[PDB]
From Swiss-Prot, chain A:
Chain's role: Glukokinase specific for aldohexoses. Phosphorylates glucose and mannose, but not fructose.
Region spans: Glucose-binding: 139-165
Gene: GLK1
One GO cellular component term noted in the UniProt record for this chain: cytosol
Region annotation Hexokinase large subdomain: where it falls in the sequence: 198-459
Broadest EC class assigned to this enzyme: transferase
Annotated organism of origin: Kluyveromyces lactis (strain ATCC 8585 / CBS 2359 / DSM 70799 / NBRC 1267 / NRRL Y-1140 / WM37) (Yeast)
Protein's recorded name: Glucokinase-1
Length: 474, 480
């Protein structure tokens, strides 16, 4: 019960507090950054057009689409059978990405990556659709959740590799052409990649297709966002406000009956100048020393589940330098990311009436960190401070979008749906509960939070991609 | 456009307003009635104003991993008799086979001296019909365990024994009052060769809804979420919650100690909150509420709270409002049939008006009123009818939140742990299908003494199959 340690922990916890005033300030600045990014090309969000202008109804049926997803660990290819009535049949296969693609001393080229993806695609069709592999007229949606300068539904150039990829010659190239050329070269020229999509876009479309007609009567999906190891979100913006879009293209869509286009905000790079975002010593150390892309996606680094546990590690290391916390032969030193957000899951809701056994056990399993009960009480305070900051900042982009689009007060009993995927928002105990708190503190107030629904929406990288491809031409 | 009619409608709408202060008053008064009703009945010295608060002898919430052989369940309501088989698979899943049959109108006519043998002999036959259809090969071999869902007030003395206190819905079989309904049902089952079907549990539709929600609530949910209430909001209303055994004073003190020694800490209580404040000491009341109770109710004087929130009377309140406006010569009923046709306007009719869009000149309202009573309407008239409907439904939704708020305060269920979330598992046509009913309930909860901070931690979750899965869970744990 070292009072020096206790006073140190309380002061560190106070550095993570996000006040009502701060939420308001960031919500206003986020809308400003949204508008700057919609202007033609800054301190504005990427606000990247996705060229998706139609939300599915849920009754589309009578078609089978293909979908491919390149992630940080696996490459997935699947077939999506739309059955109507909010249902679908899906067959999928995942294969690990060779580790050579994440190491930069192997002369890895874009042809190596996209030829391997074409191979996996060929293996999938040979297994699940052998009779129609070379004959069928497949339409495929390519889920590519990386910074991409999208110029149409089927064309976009890689801006920067994230998630640890190390393929240099992909930057600046249309990834749809790179993938299509390899698909042609292995005898799958009948597989046309007709859509380039994000996991955020897919999450929104997937929720629109599964959202029942009775549910969708008063509920309306307005946002598709991810809160996992990374963060991002998308929403529907009025065509008139997307000034960076070719004004001639705008009129073409307006005459065809379109009124909105989904925007990939890429809000992980929100306020990278840190003009208003919080910043602790631990946030700076994580950015400049333990990040694959130092200086980028700083907002992401304050909410993502990849860094939450690391924030705690650096807090305990700093407490050990002050001779306030005894690591007692642990393995926290010189082992970045050894404390994961999963470790914190067992500490967040751990009960003190159990002498914090789950906390004791969770720390021994991760780094053989032996602890006293009084130390665990204080470690829990640090964890709860870390997660609340992430949860409160996570609500800012959502609040900003609902205010800009004036989506809450659209009709009597108007309810809005925020489709959410990701390890943190889905499984971190009380994360969504704390997001709802921040929303109630944000300018939408308690009245608005009551009409907002954070609903978990899975299958974004499969059904969502298939839906983008349905309306496009083979 | 008639400003005379508009001024009358707006003034009628203001009579249905439930204020924040009124919610607070009713929430505090409801907690008082909860405590009066948990006390034993030595006399009626202000205790007659207490809620029934009936012990159910259900003391264990399912975990979600319960599993075992197919159980049977029977459900008698005010309209239908249901028989089903429920296979509990563990891991929050189950397979259910069910059959529904309407209660013959023979039971709703009081000029035939209908007896308990007629009812329970009919139920035994339907049960036999169910087993012969879905389990023909094993109807006579298995040792079936059945849970009996009986959505009526019952002076329950154990999990498998309880005497009917009063028929509360649309039919009255006089010789059933005071008799154990499990014994009446079991004897008729024996007489038709289903003596191998043992009725081992008597449960309420509220209790079953709570138990079914405990079984479906995920293990990850059970970390922070905890089901605390099972409620019904349909043609009737009622709810249940878990009370500490120490607080159930009407229970035999020896039974209290016996259960505490067995590791029990709470028992589910059937509040029967449909009879809340039948003296109308604080509930709102319009002339239309009085007219419906004394002239169009099968049980005049009873379940007045229910008559202000249940979906059986919401549409009827509108009918009496339109009839009263025609007596004042402000509204033209034309060639409609609202006169002398009670309940012809149903809550489903009002469901199409609640969210009907005015930018389409309220077409759904036009169609719903022509189909229901051939009432032709103008746009200006439909605007005003929609206002009346929205006033009626909001009052129902606001009063519906009062018992829930009261239970959460009485049991201090919101502030039990960091990130403490509570689940109110609810069934019924209104809370499930009436557009915006739950949204308006959440509003009233935020206005109640739990405040916005508390509403955010309350989750009104629709829980179906409660009268089956809930009964099956009682029969799984009970002995054949």
């Amino acid at each position: 019960s070292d009072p020096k340690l206790t006073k140190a922990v309380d002061s560190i916890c106070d550095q993570f507090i996000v006040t009502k005033s701060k939420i308001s300030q960031l919500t206003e600045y986020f809308i400003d950054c949204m508008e700057k990014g919609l202007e033609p090309c800054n301190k504005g969000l990427p606000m990247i057009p996705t060229f998706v202008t139609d939300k599915p109804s849920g009754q589309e049926h009578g078609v089978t689409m293909l979908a491919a997803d390149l992630g940080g660990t696996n490459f997935r290819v699947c077939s999506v059978e739309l059955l109507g009535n909010h249902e679908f049949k899906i067959e999928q296969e995942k294969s690990k990405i060779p580790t050579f693609f994440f190491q930069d001393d192997h002369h890895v080229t874009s042809k190596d990556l996209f030829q391997h993806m074409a191979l996996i695609t060929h293996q999938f069709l040979t297994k699940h659709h052998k009779d129609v592999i070379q004959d069928y007229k497949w339409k495929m949606g390519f889920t590519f959740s990386y910074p991409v300068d999208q110029t149409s539904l089927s064309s976009g150039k890689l801006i920067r590799w994230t998630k640890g990829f190390k393929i240099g010659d992909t930057v600046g190239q249309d990834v749809v052409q790179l993938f299509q050329q390899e698909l042609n070269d292995i005898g799958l020229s009948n597989v046309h990649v007709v859509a380039l999509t994000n996991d955020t876009t897919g999450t929104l479309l997937a929720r629109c297709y599964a959202s029942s007609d009775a549910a969708r009567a008063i509920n309306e999906p307005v946002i598709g966002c991810i809160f996992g190891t990374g963060t991002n979100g998308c929403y529907m913006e009025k065509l008139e406000n997307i000034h960076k879009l070719d004004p001639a293209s705008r009129e073409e869509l307006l005459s065809q009956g379109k009124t909105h286009m989904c925007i990939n905000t890429e809000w992980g790079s929100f306020d990278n100048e840190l003009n208003h975002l919080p910043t602790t010593s631990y946030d700076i150390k994580i950015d400049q020393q333990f990040s694959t892309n130092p200086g980028f996606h700083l907002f992401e680094k304050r909410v993502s589940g990849l860094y939450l546990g690391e924030i705690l590690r650096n807090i305990l290391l700093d407490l050990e330098k002050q001779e306030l916390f005894d690591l007692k032969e642990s393995v926290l030193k010189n082992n970045p990311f050894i404390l994961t957000t999963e470790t914190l899951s067992h500490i967040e809701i751990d009960t003190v009436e159990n002498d914090l056994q789950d906390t004791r056990d969770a720390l021994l399993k991760a780094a053989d960190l032996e602890t006293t009960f009084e130390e665990r009480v204080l470690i829990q305070k640090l964890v709860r401070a870390i997660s609340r900051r992430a949860a409160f900042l996570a609500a800012v982009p959502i609040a900003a979008i609902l205010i800009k689009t004036n989506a809450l007060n659209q009709s009597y009993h108007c309810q809005v749906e925020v489709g959410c995927d990701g390890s943190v928002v889905e499984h971190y105990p009380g994360f969504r509960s704390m997001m709802r708190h921040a929303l109630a503190l944000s300018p939408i107030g308690p009245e608005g939070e009551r009409d907002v629904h954070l609903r978990i929406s899975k299958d974004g990288s499969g059904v969502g991609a298939a839906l983008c491809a349905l309306h496009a031409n083979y």
